[PDB]
């Protein structure tokens, strides 16, 4: 229990560590994935999936962004 990050973003009515903006196809409405520093990419993806009622195919799509974030592909590693 140390995920009290200074940078907390509030989406709709809740504060989280990272809120990724994911589009469905059109501009509005846009979806925000509330990810926590101490959460598993697949867990958060699934949590959001059942929360906003999405298709299982969306799991990999949203989880990949979370995975790649921690993977640091578009950052320069930094996992170990």
């Amino acid at each position: 229990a140390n995920q009290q990050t200074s940078g907390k973003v509030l989406y709709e009515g809740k504060e989280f560590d990272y809120v990724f903006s994911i589009d469905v196809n059109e501009g509005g409405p846009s979806y925000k994935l509330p990810y926590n520093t101490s959460d598993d990419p697949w867990l958060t993806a699934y949590n959001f999936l059942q929360k906003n009622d999405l298709n299982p195919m969306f799991l990999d799509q949203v989880a990949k962004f979370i995975i790649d974030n921690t993977k640091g592909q578009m950052l320069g590693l930094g996992n170990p």
């Binding site: 589009d23 469905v24 196809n25 059109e26 999405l54 298709n55 195919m57 969306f58 990999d60 799509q61 989880a63 990949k64 962004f65 790649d68 592909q73 578009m74």
Partner: protein, 76 residues
């Protein structure tokens, strides 16, 4: 018709294909332009994976739409 394929990183690419073009050929176009293997290339539209046996018209894809380009999750 042209679709805006948004890569995982957020980079949006423009692909110019015909409505009668099957998803497999569409994948091949990106395979030649950007150089992304069709088997590892995962295209998701509205939460549905674009099957090679379908076309843009089959999925009722409107022009100037935002698509999502994802990579394979597992290798085998």
């Amino acid at each position: 018709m042209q679709i805006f394929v948004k890569t995982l990183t957020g980079k949006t690419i423009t692909l110019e294909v015909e409505p009668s073009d099957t998803i497999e050929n569409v994948k091949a176009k990106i395979q030649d332009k950007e150089g992304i293997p069709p088997d590892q290339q995962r295209l998701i539209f509205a939460g549905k994976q674009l099957e090679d046996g379908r076309t843009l018209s089959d999925y009722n894809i409107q022009k100037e739409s935002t698509l999502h380009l994802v990579l394979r999750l597992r290798g085998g």
